[PDB]
Enzyme design. Structure first.
Site, PDB file in Angstrom:
ATOM      1  N   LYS A  13       0.812  -1.213   0.000  1.00 41.61           N
ATOM      2  CA  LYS A  13       0.000   0.000   0.000  1.00 41.61           C
ATOM      3  C   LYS A  13       0.850   1.269   0.000  1.00 41.61           C
ATOM      4  O   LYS A  13       0.610   2.183  -0.792  1.00 41.61           O
ATOM      5  CB  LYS A  13      -0.940  -0.004   1.207  1.00 41.61           C
ATOM      6  CG  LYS A  13      -1.881  -1.206   1.238  1.00 41.61           C
ATOM      7  CD  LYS A  13      -2.896  -1.129   2.370  1.00 41.61           C
ATOM      8  CE  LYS A  13      -2.248  -1.228   3.751  1.00 41.61           C
ATOM      9  NZ  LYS A  13      -1.487  -2.496   3.938  1.00 41.61           N
ATOM     10  N   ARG A  88      -8.989   1.224   9.850  1.00 40.03           N
ATOM     11  CA  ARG A  88      -8.420  -0.095  10.084  1.00 40.03           C
ATOM     12  C   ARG A  88      -9.363  -0.968  10.899  1.00 40.03           C
ATOM     13  O   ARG A  88      -9.091  -2.147  11.125  1.00 40.03           O
ATOM     14  CB  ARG A  88      -7.073   0.037  10.792  1.00 40.03           C
ATOM     15  CG  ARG A  88      -6.166  -1.161  10.626  1.00 40.03           C
ATOM     16  CD  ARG A  88      -4.725  -0.718  10.514  1.00 40.03           C
ATOM     17  NE  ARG A  88      -3.798  -1.843  10.539  1.00 40.03           N
ATOM     18  CZ  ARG A  88      -2.499  -1.745  10.275  1.00 40.03           C
ATOM     19  NH1 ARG A  88      -1.968  -0.573   9.951  1.00 40.03           N
ATOM     20  NH2 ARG A  88      -1.731  -2.825  10.326  1.00 40.03           N
ATOM     21  N   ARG A 123      12.121  -5.142   4.654  1.00 41.06           N
ATOM     22  CA  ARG A 123      11.695  -3.757   4.476  1.00 41.06           C
ATOM     23  C   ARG A 123      12.660  -2.753   5.107  1.00 41.06           C
ATOM     24  O   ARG A 123      13.075  -2.913   6.254  1.00 41.06           O
ATOM     25  CB  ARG A 123      10.293  -3.559   5.061  1.00 41.06           C
ATOM     26  CG  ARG A 123       9.814  -2.119   5.001  1.00 41.06           C
ATOM     27  CD  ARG A 123       8.303  -2.025   5.092  1.00 41.06           C
ATOM     28  NE  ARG A 123       7.791  -2.515   6.368  1.00 41.06           N
ATOM     29  CZ  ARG A 123       6.503  -2.706   6.629  1.00 41.06           C
ATOM     30  NH1 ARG A 123       5.590  -2.459   5.698  1.00 41.06           N
ATOM     31  NH2 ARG A 123       6.122  -3.152   7.819  1.00 41.06           N
ATOM     32  N   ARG A 156      12.393  -0.773  10.715  1.00 42.29           N
ATOM     33  CA  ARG A 156      11.353  -0.586  11.715  1.00 42.29           C
ATOM     34  C   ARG A 156      11.489  -1.603  12.842  1.00 42.29           C
ATOM     35  O   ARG A 156      11.815  -2.768  12.613  1.00 42.29           O
ATOM     36  CB  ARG A 156       9.969  -0.690  11.077  1.00 42.29           C
ATOM     37  CG  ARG A 156       9.511   0.586  10.392  1.00 42.29           C
ATOM     38  CD  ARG A 156       8.277   0.352   9.541  1.00 42.29           C
ATOM     39  NE  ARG A 156       7.204  -0.303  10.285  1.00 42.29           N
ATOM     40  CZ  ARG A 156       5.982  -0.508   9.807  1.00 42.29           C
ATOM     41  NH1 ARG A 156       5.664  -0.100   8.587  1.00 42.29           N
ATOM     42  NH2 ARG A 156       5.073  -1.117  10.555  1.00 42.29           N
ATOM     43  N   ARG A 167       0.497  -9.026  13.713  1.00 42.48           N
ATOM     44  CA  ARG A 167      -0.206  -8.005  12.937  1.00 42.48           C
ATOM     45  C   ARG A 167      -1.200  -8.648  11.978  1.00 42.48           C
ATOM     46  O   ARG A 167      -2.279  -8.107  11.727  1.00 42.48           O
ATOM     47  CB  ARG A 167       0.775  -7.135  12.148  1.00 42.48           C
ATOM     48  CG  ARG A 167       1.501  -6.098  12.979  1.00 42.48           C
ATOM     49  CD  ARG A 167       1.780  -4.819  12.188  1.00 42.48           C
ATOM     50  NE  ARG A 167       2.870  -4.953  11.224  1.00 42.48           N
ATOM     51  CZ  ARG A 167       4.155  -5.048  11.556  1.00 42.48           C
ATOM     52  NH1 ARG A 167       4.518  -5.057  12.832  1.00 42.48           N
ATOM     53  NH2 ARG A 167       5.079  -5.148  10.611  1.00 42.48           N
TER      54      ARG A 167
HETATM   55  N1  LIG Z   1       4.824  -5.580  -5.815  1.00 40.12           N
HETATM   56  C1  LIG Z   1       5.817  -5.724  -4.734  1.00 40.12           C
HETATM   57  N2  LIG Z   1       6.583  -6.821  -4.954  1.00 40.12           N
HETATM   58  C2  LIG Z   1       7.575  -7.157  -4.077  1.00 40.12           C
HETATM   59  N3  LIG Z   1       7.798  -6.390  -2.977  1.00 40.12           N
HETATM   60  C3  LIG Z   1       7.019  -5.272  -2.752  1.00 40.12           C
HETATM   61  C4  LIG Z   1       6.040  -4.946  -3.625  1.00 40.12           C
HETATM   62  N4  LIG Z   1       5.427  -3.814  -3.178  1.00 40.12           N
HETATM   63  C5  LIG Z   1       6.032  -3.447  -2.023  1.00 40.12           C
HETATM   64  N5  LIG Z   1       7.028  -4.331  -1.754  1.00 40.12           N
HETATM   65  C6  LIG Z   1       7.926  -4.355  -0.646  1.00 40.12           C
HETATM   66  O1  LIG Z   1       7.240  -5.262   0.515  1.00 40.12           O
HETATM   67  C7  LIG Z   1       7.372  -4.651   1.644  1.00 40.12           C
HETATM   68  C8  LIG Z   1       5.984  -4.128   2.098  1.00 40.12           C
HETATM   69  O2  LIG Z   1       5.564  -3.104   1.216  1.00 40.12           O
HETATM   70  P1  LIG Z   1       4.738  -1.845   1.806  1.00 40.12           P
HETATM   71  O3  LIG Z   1       4.555  -0.842   0.712  1.00 40.12           O
HETATM   72  O4  LIG Z   1       5.434  -1.257   2.994  1.00 40.12           O
HETATM   73  O5  LIG Z   1       3.349  -2.459   2.208  1.00 40.12           O
HETATM   74  P2  LIG Z   1       2.211  -1.814   3.164  1.00 40.12           P
HETATM   75  O6  LIG Z   1       0.886  -2.419   2.735  1.00 40.12           O
HETATM   76  O7  LIG Z   1       2.191  -0.308   3.044  1.00 40.12           O
HETATM   77  O8  LIG Z   1       2.571  -2.240   4.614  1.00 40.12           O
HETATM   78  P3  LIG Z   1       2.045  -1.511   5.944  1.00 40.12           P
HETATM   79  O9  LIG Z   1       3.130  -0.583   6.516  1.00 40.12           O
HETATM   80  O10 LIG Z   1       0.771  -0.706   5.634  1.00 40.12           O
HETATM   81  O11 LIG Z   1       1.685  -2.725   6.963  1.00 40.12           O
HETATM   82  P4  LIG Z   1       2.058  -2.822   8.527  1.00 40.12           P
HETATM   83  O12 LIG Z   1       0.826  -3.313   9.267  1.00 40.12           O
HETATM   84  O13 LIG Z   1       3.164  -3.810   8.698  1.00 40.12           O
HETATM   85  O14 LIG Z   1       2.525  -1.434   9.080  1.00 40.12           O
HETATM   86  P5  LIG Z   1       1.589  -0.232   9.544  1.00 40.12           P
HETATM   87  O15 LIG Z   1       2.398   1.049   9.547  1.00 40.12           O
HETATM   88  O16 LIG Z   1       0.405  -0.087   8.613  1.00 40.12           O
HETATM   89  O17 LIG Z   1       1.068  -0.512  11.018  1.00 40.12           O
HETATM   90  C9  LIG Z   1       2.030  -0.650  12.060  1.00 40.12           C
HETATM   91  C10 LIG Z   1       1.315  -0.375  13.440  1.00 40.12           C
HETATM   92  O18 LIG Z   1       0.878   0.848  13.491  1.00 40.12           O
HETATM   93  C11 LIG Z   1      -0.544   0.828  14.260  1.00 40.12           C
HETATM   94  N6  LIG Z   1      -1.493   1.386  13.382  1.00 40.12           N
HETATM   95  C12 LIG Z   1      -1.262   1.921  12.169  1.00 40.12           C
HETATM   96  N7  LIG Z   1      -2.449   2.369  11.659  1.00 40.12           N
HETATM   97  C13 LIG Z   1      -3.412   2.112  12.584  1.00 40.12           C
HETATM   98  C14 LIG Z   1      -4.768   2.356  12.585  1.00 40.12           C
HETATM   99  N8  LIG Z   1      -5.725   2.943  11.694  1.00 40.12           N
HETATM  100  N9  LIG Z   1      -5.518   1.994  13.656  1.00 40.12           N
HETATM  101  C15 LIG Z   1      -4.934   1.394  14.725  1.00 40.12           C
HETATM  102  N10 LIG Z   1      -3.586   1.150  14.725  1.00 40.12           N
HETATM  103  C16 LIG Z   1      -2.835   1.515  13.651  1.00 40.12           C
HETATM  104  C17 LIG Z   1      -0.755  -0.418  14.590  1.00 40.12           C
HETATM  105  O19 LIG Z   1      -0.181  -0.665  15.965  1.00 40.12           O
HETATM  106  C18 LIG Z   1       0.053  -1.236  13.576  1.00 40.12           C
HETATM  107  O20 LIG Z   1       0.362  -2.455  14.041  1.00 40.12           O
HETATM  108  C19 LIG Z   1       8.325  -3.476   1.393  1.00 40.12           C
HETATM  109  O21 LIG Z   1       9.608  -3.810   1.729  1.00 40.12           O
HETATM  110  C20 LIG Z   1       8.192  -3.203  -0.121  1.00 40.12           C
HETATM  111  O22 LIG Z   1       9.469  -2.672  -0.656  1.00 40.12           O
HETATM  112 MG   LIG Z   2       0.969   1.617   4.467  1.00 37.69          MG
END
Ligand SMILES: Nc1ncnc2c1ncn2[C@@H]1O[C@H](COP(=O)(O)OP(=O)(O)OP(=O)(O)OP(=O)(O)OP(=O)(O)OC[C@H]2O[C@@H](n3cnc4c(N)ncnc43)[C@H](O)[C@@H]2O)[C@@H](O)[C@H]1O
Ligand SMILES: [Mg+2]
Ligand code: NA
Length: 214
Positions: A13, A88, A123, A156, A167
């Site tokens: 995403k 979320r 990542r 991270r 997660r």
């Molecule tokens: N086509 C492709 N092919 C191959 N490789 C590829 C590719 N596309 C991308 N890649 C690679 O694959 C990897 C992933 O790509 P990437 O682009 O980082 O994927 P992503 O979907 O954006 O991953 P997220 O960061 O959204 O998921 P997360 O839950 O782990 O972290 P978040 O910050 O959301 O959440 C973390 C914490 O924050 C909290 N939090 C965040 N938001 C909320 C919310 N609304 N409500 C409550 N808690 C929240 C929670 O505690 C949560 O646990 C990268 O290395 C990339 O280079």
């Molecule tokens: Mg994201």
């Protein structure tokens, strides 16, 4: 234009958000990025997220709703924005409805569970911008360096395998229901809904999304 990105952890995403931000000139609202920034700066609004994120659990609805409400009131959001990680949970989505926040597209990123761990463990992030890389699948031009700023990338703290698995459980328990939520909204004509294959190469996912967004 207003857009929501849906998908499991590591679905790509944030990667694709960068391209959408550029083409349509709207800011990325990444709750993950915002929470990590609040923790790093010790900001009163969000620093509380530190232990929760390390545990691989969701931050409370009220905290992230407050963060998002603050962020989309900024003037750079006046002509549209991209929501990345929000909503979320069902209550987060209903809070948007309650506030009268309509969107134009909901875009679902589909990736098999079995791909997620090896994505996230590789990542590397540029925190100031939200740009992310993968040491094998999508590396920087120069190892450990952001392509745009040349600044040193980081890992991270919550990106180890066990935390990723937690997660993923949270996602399937709390977040997957948003597919039906916004599918239903789309059938009511309140938004468009589209699902893409997130296993394709980065440039092809980008092309598929561009075709949807016209
Ligand atoms: N086509 C492709 N092919 C191959 N490789 C590829 C590719 N596309 C991308 N890649 C690679 O694959 C990897 C992933 O790509 P990437 O682009 O980082 O994927 P992503 O979907 O954006 O991953 P997220 O960061 O959204 O998921 P997360 O839950 O782990 O972290 P978040 O910050 O959301 O959440 C973390 C914490 O924050 C909290 N939090 C965040 N938001 C909320 C919310 N609304 N409500 C409550 N808690 C929240 C929670 O505690 C949560 O646990 C990268 O290395 C990339 O280079
Ligand atoms: Mg994201
Ligand atoms: Na709409």
């Amino acid at each position: 234009m207003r857009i929501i990105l849906l998908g499991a952890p590591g679905a790509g995403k944030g990667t694709q958000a960068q391209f959408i931000m550029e083409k349509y000139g709207i800011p990325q609202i990444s709750t993950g990025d915002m929470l990590r920034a609040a923790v790093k700066s010790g900001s009163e609004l969000g620093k509380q997220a530190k232990d929760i994120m390390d545990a691989g659990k969701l931050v409370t609805d009220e905290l992230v709703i407050a963060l998002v409400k603050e962020r989309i009131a900024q003037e750079d959001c006046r002509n549209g924005f991209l929501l990345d990680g929000f909503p979320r949970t069902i209550p987060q989505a209903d809070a948007m409805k309650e506030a009268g926040i309509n969107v134009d597209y909901v875009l679902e990123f589909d990736v098999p569970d079995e791909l997620i761990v090896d994505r996230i463990v590789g990542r590397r992030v540029h925190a100031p911008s939200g740009r992310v890389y993968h040491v094998k699948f999508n590396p920087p031009k120069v190892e450990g360096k952001d392509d745009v700023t040349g600044e040193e990338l980081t890992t991270r703290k919550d990106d180890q395998e066990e935390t990723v698995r937690k997660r993923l459980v949270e996602y399937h328990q709390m977040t997957a229901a948003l597919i039906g939520y916004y599918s239903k909204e789309a059938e009511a004509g309140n938004t468009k809904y589209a699902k893409v294959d997130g296993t394709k190469p980065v440039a092809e996912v980008r092309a598929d999304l561009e075709k949807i967004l016209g």
